[PDB]
Write a protein that binds this ligand. Structure first.
Ligand code: SF4
Ligand code: SF4
Ligand code: FCO
Ligand code: F3S
Ligand code: MG
Ligand code: NI
Lengths: 262, 545
């Protein structure tokens, strides 16, 4: 049997929305990916082993002879020597730091691992940081809250078969984050014609008018949402709701208030 | 023979608890092979309640939904209900229907994933599936379940071949160091049953994609929906014919898988693990109800919930009391918060983090300890099931009796880990039986009148509570508004009820109590701890927020 590349997946300060996003993949499905393409050797949410046995699985993986790629979900809480976020009695920052030191590459799945995320929003009680922010390792960022599985799986496959994809300033692959949400939005004609919904109960809203007046952050957000959709069926603006800017660094503080413009 | 049990005396710690959401550490004391004391220790704090202070109340739902991506949506819903109540807006009938359907969609997706991908590996030895003869397995499936191509010998063999190649490669991935490798006394299933369950496990990986797609038609996307607003919903397209036909189609498919695979698998597992009908029971149950026909206020929610609200104490099914929202409080005595924070009603909640040290039996969790007139309350599917059954709710009465009859156990056998697991399937079946009716209700309503959001005004000063029964149980968000901003925002979440630490009396929470008496066949591989903990369907990000 042909050897499959080892992938260690770490959970830090997170909601597991990025793991859930990942497993909505259909090109391929999650089973094909983990049976044919990669060897997923640590994943707290779905692995059989627990406790000491799980810890040993991680340490086995980290010591693999063919090396491993590191996926990180969640931010790193740094207050009190990292003790507000612990796995197997170790601070998450210490474990992530160990794992990042020998990784072939590091992929940050989600806005939390990439940039700090929800726990980092003011006043940031746990002193949460992004992976690159807290450690100073360079990361491939797949942000969104959560990212589309197309963007994460696509990045993973590219890294394993082609090399590092071209990244923007914020370390995001241009393949997926090269375009503004707004530039691909079907409501762009309404925007251009100054046809905005003033409220969600309005006739303008019922007619599918632009949501800019209602705080849509599409014009300042880099993501491929209208182009690829979510779950093969929909995206927020199609569902009549403004973009929150959820793939942008620190959006929780830069894009709020969500129903207003700056 | 009897339930396997070692003679082990000493401590056991499991950390990480895997196949849950979030970071849990479980510590037990074991004497002569049985758990004698227990601690549930949540290991991550994020502080969303702190983060919300001073912000726009319209923003709340977007922050709080990130409490959890497994129980995605439910916090956006609870926040919307909360803010709707605080500004005193009653949402349009179409908004109530759309909000409740997305919740039904969430139950279906959440429960299927839990049984297969989080819980099953405690009962199913995947490597023993390789021992199975696929023809015998096909014959077993045929007799225990509706006939289906995916249960054929040809199908089961393909699963077995794929699994064989995977195992023979030496890279066991998510099965590495599994508690079942090399066999395990506490695993009872014949190899054929293991194979059937394993094939369905793989099928369920694909089926959860369809369940989430259904949800996304109304919710905009999954994970993390984006269709709720103050006063109702934004998704006018979700009231129209073609998307609702797609939604029904996908839902029918998911429900077919629930009726063909999930329930039969659950019943086969429960049949072999009958002894687990006497392990992991608790005595108190609480629900806020869900799927209400009148959501104009918290009051009307509690009263009109189709899965009814209620309170049960000391296993007394003859006495279901109304929920006294005034009698809910949270303790921090055994939690990582500043002392003197005990007995706070959520309107007066304080979130003042203060860490001590790992395994400090005085302070050992990031969860608070929610209590109801001093009493620990189990919430979730088993709670809803007991309350509905006791109240004579026809769907629950009929599904429960079907289960109890297929298993030949009294209803009292439900106060256990087996019952907790069975109740999760029971209600999934009931949600499935209601999907077509609910969808037709909204399709018609939406084609006669498309009103989806009501007008409202931000008060200078108000308070409000939003109630939901999420897949894991009774959820409440509580807001104080002052100067049109968030002055206080408190979440009290089902996993806080279930998996929080001791209360100010030193009284154990539901999971800690459930763990007392757990037999341990093999201290090196304590699957029995996992079985009970997983049956509560822990969500630690939810519990701590
Ligand atoms: S980026 Fe969003 S969905 Fe992903 S873990 Fe963070 S809060 Fe959850
Ligand atoms: S709805 Fe948002 S993304 Fe679409 S055109 Fe308007 S501002 Fe741009
Ligand atoms: N279900 C669910 Fe999540 C928890 N606990 C919430 O609310
Ligand atoms: S909120 Fe996020 S999911 Fe796309 S539409 Fe906006 S970037
Ligand atoms: Mg709280
Ligand atoms: Ni949750």
């Amino acid at each position: 049997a042909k050897h499959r590349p080892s992938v260690v997946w770490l959970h830090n300060a997170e909601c597991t929305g990025c793991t859930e996003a990942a497993i909505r993949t259909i090109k391929p499905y999650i089973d094909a990916l983990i049976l044919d393409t990669i060897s997923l050797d640590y994943q707290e949410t779905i692995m059989a082993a627990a406790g000491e046995a799980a810890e040993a699985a991680l340490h086995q993986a980290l010591e693999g002879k063919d090396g491993y790629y590191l996926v990180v979900e969640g931010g790193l809480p740094t207050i009190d020597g990292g003790q507000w976020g612990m796995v197997a009695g170790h601070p998450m920052i210490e474990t992530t730091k160990k794992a990042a030191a020998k990784a072939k590459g590091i992929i940050c799945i989600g806005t939390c691992s990439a940039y700090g995320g929800v726990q980092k929003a003011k006043p940031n009680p746990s002193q949460a940081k992004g992976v690159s922010e807290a450690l100073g390792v360079k990361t491939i960022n797949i942000p969104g809250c959560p990212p589309n599985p197309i963007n994460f799986v696509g990045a993973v496959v590219h890294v394993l078969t082609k090399g590092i994809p071209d990244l923007d300033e914020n370390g995001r692959p241009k393949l997926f984050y090269g375009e503004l949400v707004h530039d691909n939005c079907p409501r762009l004609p309404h925007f251009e014609a100054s046809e905005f919904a003033p409220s969600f109960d309005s006739e303008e809203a019922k007619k599918g008018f632009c949501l800019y007046e209602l705080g849509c952050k599409g014009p300042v957000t880099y993501n491929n949402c209208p182009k690829v959709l979510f779950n093969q069926v929909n995206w927020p603006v199609q569902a009549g709701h403004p973009c929150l800017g959820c793939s942008e660094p620190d959006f929780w503080d830069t894009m709020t208030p969500f129903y207003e413009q700056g | 023979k009897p339930t396997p049990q070692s003679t082990f005396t000493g401590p056991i710690v499991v950390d990480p608890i895997t196949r849950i959401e979030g970071h849990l550490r479980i510590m037990v004391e074991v004497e002569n092979g049985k758990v004698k004391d227990a601690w549930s220790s949540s290991q991550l704090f994020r502080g969303l309640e702190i983060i919300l202070k001073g912000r726009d109340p319209r923003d709340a739902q977007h922050f709080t939904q990130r409490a959890c991506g497994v129980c995605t949506y439910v916090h956006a819903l609870a926040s919307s209900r909360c803010v709707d109540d605080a500004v005193k807006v009653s949402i349009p009938a179409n908004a109530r229907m759309m909000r409740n359907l997305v919740m039904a969609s969430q139950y279906l997706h959440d429960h299927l994933v839990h049984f297969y991908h989080l819980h099953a590996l405690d009962w199913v030895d995947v490597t023993a599936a390789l021992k199975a003869d696929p023809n015998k397995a096909a014959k077993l499936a045929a007799s225990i379940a509706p006939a289906r191509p995916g249960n054929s010998a040809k199908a089961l063999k393909a699963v077995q071949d794929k699994l064989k190649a995977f195992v023979e490669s030496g890279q066991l991935g998510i099965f590495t160091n599994a508690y079942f490798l090399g066999g395990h006394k506490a695993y009872y299933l014949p190899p054929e049953v293991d194979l059937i369950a394993t094939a369905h496990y793989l099928e369920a990986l694909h089926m959860q994609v369809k369940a989430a797609s259904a949800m996304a038609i109304l919710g905009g996307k999954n994970p993390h929906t984006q269709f709720t607003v103050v006063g109702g919903c934004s998704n006018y397209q979700g009231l129209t014919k073609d998307p609702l036909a797609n939604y029904l189609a996908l839902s029918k498919e998911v429900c077919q898988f629930v009726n063909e695979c999930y329930i039969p698998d659950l019943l086969a597992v429960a049949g072999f693990y009958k002894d687990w009908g006497g392990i992991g029971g608790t005595s108190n149950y609480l629900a806020f109800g869900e799927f209400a026909t009148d959501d104009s206020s918290p009051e009307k929610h509690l009263a009109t919930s189709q899965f009814p609200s209620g309170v049960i104490t000391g296993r007394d099914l003859g006495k279901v009391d109304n929920v006294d929202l005034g009698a809910i409080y949270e303790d921090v005595k055994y939690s990582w918060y500043a002392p003197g924070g005990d007995g706070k009603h959520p309107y007066d909640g304080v979130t003042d983090p203060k860490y001590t040290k790992l395994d400090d039996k005085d302070h050992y969790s990031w969860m608070k300890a929610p209590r109801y007139k001093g009493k620990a309350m189990e919430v979730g599917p088993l709670a809803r099931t007991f309350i509905a059954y006791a109240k004579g709710q026809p769907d629950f009465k009929k599904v429960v009796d079907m289960v109890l009859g297929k298993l030949s156990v009294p209803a009292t056998a439900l106060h256990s880990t087996l019952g907790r697991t069975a109740a999760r399937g029971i209600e999934t079946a009931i949600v499935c039986a209601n999907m077509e009716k609910w969808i037709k209700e909204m399709a018609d309503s939406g084609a006669k009148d498309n009103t989806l959001c009501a007008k409202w005004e931000m008060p200078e000063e108000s308070k409000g509570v939003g109630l939901a029964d999420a897949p894991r149980g009774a959820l409440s968000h509580w807001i104080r508004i002052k100067g049109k901003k968030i002055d206080n925002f408190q979440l009290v979440v089902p996993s806080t009820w279930n998996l929080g630490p001791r209360g100010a009396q030193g009284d154990k929470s539901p999971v800690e109590e459930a763990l007392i008496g757990t037999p341990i066949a093999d201290p090196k591989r304590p699957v029995e701890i996992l079985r009970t903990v997983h049956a509560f369907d822990p969500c630690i990000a939810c519990g701590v927020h």
